[PDB]
Amino acid sequence: PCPAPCACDLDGGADCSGKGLVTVPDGLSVFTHSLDLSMNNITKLPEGAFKGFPYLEELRLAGNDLSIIHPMALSGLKELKVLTLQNNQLKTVPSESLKGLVSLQSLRLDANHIVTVPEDSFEGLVQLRHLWLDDNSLTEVPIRPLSNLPSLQALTLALNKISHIPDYAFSNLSSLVVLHLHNNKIRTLGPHCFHGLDNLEALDLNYNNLIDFPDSIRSLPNLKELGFHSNSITIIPDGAFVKNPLLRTIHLYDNPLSFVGNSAFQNLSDLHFLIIRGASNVQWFPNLTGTNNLESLTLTGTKIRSIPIKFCQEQKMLRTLDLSYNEISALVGFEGCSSLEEVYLQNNQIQEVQNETFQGLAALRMLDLSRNRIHTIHKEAFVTLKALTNLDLSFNDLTAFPTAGLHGLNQLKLTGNPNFKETL
Amino acid sequence: APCPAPCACDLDGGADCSGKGLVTVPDGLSVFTHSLDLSMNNITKLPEGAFKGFPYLEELRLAGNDLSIIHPMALSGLKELKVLTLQNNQLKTVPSESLKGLVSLQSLRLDANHIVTVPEDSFEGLVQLRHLWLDDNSLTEVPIRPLSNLPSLQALTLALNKISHIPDYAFSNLSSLVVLHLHNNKIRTLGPHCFHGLDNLEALDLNYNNLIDFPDSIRSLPNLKELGFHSNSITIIPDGAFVKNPLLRTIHLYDNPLSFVGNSAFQNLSDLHFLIIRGASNVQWFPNLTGTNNLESLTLTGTKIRSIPIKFCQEQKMLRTLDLSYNEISALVGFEGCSSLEEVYLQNNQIQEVQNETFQGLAALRMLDLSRNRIHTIHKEAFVTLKALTNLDLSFNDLTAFPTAGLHGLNQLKLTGNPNFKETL
Numbered sequence: 034p035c036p037a038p039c040a041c042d043l044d045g046g047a048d049c050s051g052k053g054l055v056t057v058p059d060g061l062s063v064f065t066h067s068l069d070l071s072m073n074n075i076t077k078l079p080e081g082a083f084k085g086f087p088y089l090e091e092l093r094l095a096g097n098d099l100s101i102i103h104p105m106a107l108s109g110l111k112e113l114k115v116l117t118l119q120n121n122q123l124k125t126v127p128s129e130s131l132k133g134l135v136s137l138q139s140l141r142l143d144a145n146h147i148v149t150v151p152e153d154s155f156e157g158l159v160q161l162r163h164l165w166l167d168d169n170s171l172t173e174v175p176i177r178p179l180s181n182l183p184s185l186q187a188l189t190l191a192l193n194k195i196s197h198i199p200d201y202a203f204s205n206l207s208s209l210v211v212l213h214l215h216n217n218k219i220r221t222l223g224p225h226c227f228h229g230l231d232n233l234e235a236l237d238l239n240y241n242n243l244i245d246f247p248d249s250i251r252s253l254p255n256l257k258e259l260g261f262h263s264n265s266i267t268i269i270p271d272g273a274f275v276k277n278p279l280l281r282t283i284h285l286y287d288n289p290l291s292f293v294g295n296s297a298f299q300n301l302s303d304l305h306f307l308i309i310r311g312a313s314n315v316q317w318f319p320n321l322t323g324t325n326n327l328e329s330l331t332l333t334g335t336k337i338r339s340i341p342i343k344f345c346q347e348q349k350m351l352r353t354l355d356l357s358y359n360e361i362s363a364l365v366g367f368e369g370c371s372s373l374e375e376v377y378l379q380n381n382q383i384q385e386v387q388n389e390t391f392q393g394l395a396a397l398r399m400l401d402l403s404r405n406r407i408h409t410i411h412k413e414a415f416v417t418l419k420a421l422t423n424l425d426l427s428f429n430d431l432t433a434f435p436t437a438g439l440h441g442l443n444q445l446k447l448t449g450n451p452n453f454k455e456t457l
Numbered sequence: 458a459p460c461p462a463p464c465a466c467d468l469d470g471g472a473d474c475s476g477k478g479l480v481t482v483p484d485g486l487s488v489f490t491h492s493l494d495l496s497m498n499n500i501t502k503l504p505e506g507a508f509k510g511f512p513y514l515e516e517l518r519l520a521g522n523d524l525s526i527i528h529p530m531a532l533s534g535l536k537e538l539k540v541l542t543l544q545n546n547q548l549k550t551v552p553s554e555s556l557k558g559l560v561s562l563q564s565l566r567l568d569a570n571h572i573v574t575v576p577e578d579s580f581e582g583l584v585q586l587r588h589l590w591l592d593d594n595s596l597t598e599v600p601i602r603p604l605s606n607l608p609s610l611q612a613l614t615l616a617l618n619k620i621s622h623i624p625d626y627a628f629s630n631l632s633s634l635v636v637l638h639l640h641n642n643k644i645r646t647l648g649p650h651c652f653h654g655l656d657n658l659e660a661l662d663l664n665y666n667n668l669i670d671f672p673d674s675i676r677s678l679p680n681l682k683e684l685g686f687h688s689n690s691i692t693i694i695p696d697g698a699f700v701k702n703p704l705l706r707t708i709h710l711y712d713n714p715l716s717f718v719g720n721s722a723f724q725n726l727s728d729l730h731f732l733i734i735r736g737a738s739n740v741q742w743f744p745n746l747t748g749t750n751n752l753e754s755l756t757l758t759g760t761k762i763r764s765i766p767i768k769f770c771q772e773q774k775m776l777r778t779l780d781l782s783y784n785e786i787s788a789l790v791g792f793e794g795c796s797s798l799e800e801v802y803l804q805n806n807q808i809q810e811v812q813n814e815t816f817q818g819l820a821a822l823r824m825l826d827l828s829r830n831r832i833h834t835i836h837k838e839a840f841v842t843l844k845a846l847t848n849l850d851l852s853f854n855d856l857t858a859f860p861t862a863g864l865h866g867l868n869q870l871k872l873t874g875n876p877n878f879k880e881t882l
């Protein structure tokens with residue numbers, strides 16, 4: 034049942050993987066469930082080389098030298114649910130060969146040289162779920178080929194050369210939950226580029242060339258997760274997220290944000306993770322109601338001097354807080370947000386700290402106060418903080434080191450303080 | 458496609474009718490249904506040919522109904538059906554007549570039911586059958602004759618039943634069987650030839666049984682890879698125990714009242730990577746591991762063993778985790794030879810000191826537990842050389858002072874319960 038080079042398993046899978054083979058091995062069982070041809074030298078495929086396998090559900094050609102594929106090279110697989118073509122030499126989408134894989138739920142064309150997509154690509158695949166186009170030479174989003182995929186739940190166009198996303202490019206994919214555009218060249222988004230996708234919960238625009246805020250996302254009522262980081266965006270309007278009330282996670286960092294509406298982050302009750310970094314010119318804080326449910330907050334690279342009392346009355350969910358690398362000169366009491374396990378205050382201008390500031394925080398393992406100006410610390414401040422394995426006081430102006438308990442902590446960094454008494 | 462009201466139908470012909478409290482098969486279900494999930498409904502019984510109008514039905518899930526008995530003609534339609542799950546029902550007996558003609562069936566779940574009896578014609582034609590779940594039932598014997606009807610079976614669970622005796626040649630006709638689960642039975646006796654015929658068997662589970670003797674029957678198992686006999690009554694592991702199973706990789710013996718282990722018992726296994734022995738109260742000596750050099754995890758606990766053989770770390774270069782806790786060990790031979798060690802558990806022994814060279818050289822070693830010993834002295838520089846050490850447990854020993862060298866980068870260093878004089882001051 035199993036020809037020499039391959040190996041055949043319990044469930045009817047046959048691994049010809051990594052055999053240095055130029056052609057489909059002959060002698061394989063016709064009851065083969067799965068076939069793995071990955072990592073071989075197969076340069077080309079002949080007519081119907083898979084026709085003798087009627088039951089074959091999964092076909093892995095990943096990582097071969099395959100350049101072109103005869104239109105009929107797969108005919109006999111109407112039961113095929115998954116086809117992995119990744120890491121091969123394809124300069125184009127094998128449109129004709131994909132005619133009549135009518136059962137196909139997974140198509141990986143990612144990591145090829147693909148420049149062009151023939152207009153009729155993916156015409157019959159009505160069952161397709163996952164389409165991987167990424168890591169290719171794609172110059173534009175293939176509107177026609179994607180109009181044939183009403184079942185698609187997930188798509189990656191990432192790591193291509195795309196510069197612009199036309200209006201209604203995704204218009205026919207209503208089942209789509211996940212759209213990945215990251216690491217393209219995109220400079221321009223049509224106002225209607227995202228129209229039609231009312232099920233999309235996840236959008237990746239990261240590592241692109243964007244400049245305006247992408248208000249196209251107003252077409253996305255189901256949006257949960259949004260990345261726009263590493264772009265050129267200069268402005269986050271108030272009204273930015275108004276039409277996306279379900280957002281849990283926003284990644285905005287690595288943009289030259291010169292401006293952020295104070296209220297841009299208002300009224301997001303599902304928002305658990307908010308990351309803002311390296312916004313150089315942005316001078317100030319968020320309004321942040323009705324967002325009380327925030328889990329992790331990162332705000333760094335700015336001018337803010339301080340934080341409101343309401344902050345820890347209203348956020349009872351907050352676990353990690355990264356305020357580092359700001360201009361902050363002062364600190365409110367943190368007792369309120371009881372869920373705090375991590376607080377990073379380092380590289381600010383803060384001068385002093387009191388007792389109750391860190392009072393009643395049970396779960397806090399990590400506190401980084403390092404690289405500040407702090408000239409003194411009250412003796413009873415850290416008495417209350419357990420779980421604490423890491424306290425970084427290093428690189429301040431302080432002349433005397435507090436306790437306790439600093440006893441039993443795994444790390445206490447006191448380095449770089451001008452401690453006059455110890456020098457003696 | 459015509460999906461009826463309780464159901465949710467997909468694009469491939471699946472129909473999920475589960476959890477809607479149905480007492481009979483829904484009408485209006487497509488004739489092209491490939492998969493039908495009827496699980497978690499209230500169906501008590503089902504009539505003849507209920508599935509007759511599903512010519513293409515591949516999978517049928519009846520699990521989690523009240524199902525009591527079934528009309529011998531209820532499954533008549535289905536020659537395409539490859540998977541059938543009846544588990545979690547009231548079946549008092551294996552429905553042998555209902556299963557006649559299911560010629561495509563690869564998976565049969567009769568598990569989690571009340572079955573007392575398996576008729577002799579049971580599974581008569583299922584020559585495509587792969588997985589058979591008879592576990593969690595009332596069976597008092599292994600169904601020899603039904604099982605002879607299953608030349609293709611790769612996996613069998615008789616587990617969680619009342620079987621007390623396995624006669625010779627019981628499994629004799631399953632020559633495709635790779636996996637045999639007998640765990641949680643009452644088995645006190647195994648006929649010498651009870652495993653004859655299973656030459657493809659890679660895994661045997663005898664755990665949680667009544668065995669007084671080592672199971673010499675495994676001599677029928679040339680391809681055995683994994684063997685559990687844990688939680689039995691075996692007091693002794695004989696010489697040549699595994700001499701017919703040279704391919705063994707994993708053996709689990711723990712929770713047996715072992716007083717003695719043969720000198721050649723664990724010898725000559727070149728494929729053995731995992732050996733677990735725990736709670737052998739009267740074993741006084743480290744087993745002889747001559748010829749077994751490829752050990753990866755070794756666990757030897759609960760014994761009177763007072764020392765470790767000098768040859769040990771000379772021979773095991775693959776050893777990664779070593780659990781020696783809960784013995785009588787009073788002195789440590791050098792672990793230096795065991796170069797792959799990432800984890801060492803010595804807690805709850807008699808140990809007194811650790812010297813400079815005990816642990817010297819183990820560059821991969823993250824976890825060291827020396828707690829609950831007698832240790833009064835640790836050479837300074839003893840944990841020098843351990844670049845990977847993240848966990849050091851020195852607690853509940855006699856140390857008056859502690860070494861600091863090599864000890865700063867640790868995520869966890871536990872000193873509790875030692876008598877440190879300087880720090881009481």
Ligand SMILES: *[C@@H]1O[C@H](CO)[C@@H](O)[C@H](O)[C@H]1NC(C)=O
Pocket residue numbers: 720721724745746747
């Ligand atoms: C271990 O077994 C070998 C081979 O039987 C033998 O040479 C050696 O003495 C044994 N070690 C003991 C009995 O401690």
Ligand SMILES: *[C@@H]1O[C@H](CO)[C@@H](O)[C@H](O)[C@H]1NC(C)=O
Pocket residue numbers: 813814817838839841842
């Ligand atoms: C202990 O062993 C280390 C590593 O081999 C060595 O550098 C050190 O000098 C030894 N110390 C003593 C006192 O033998």
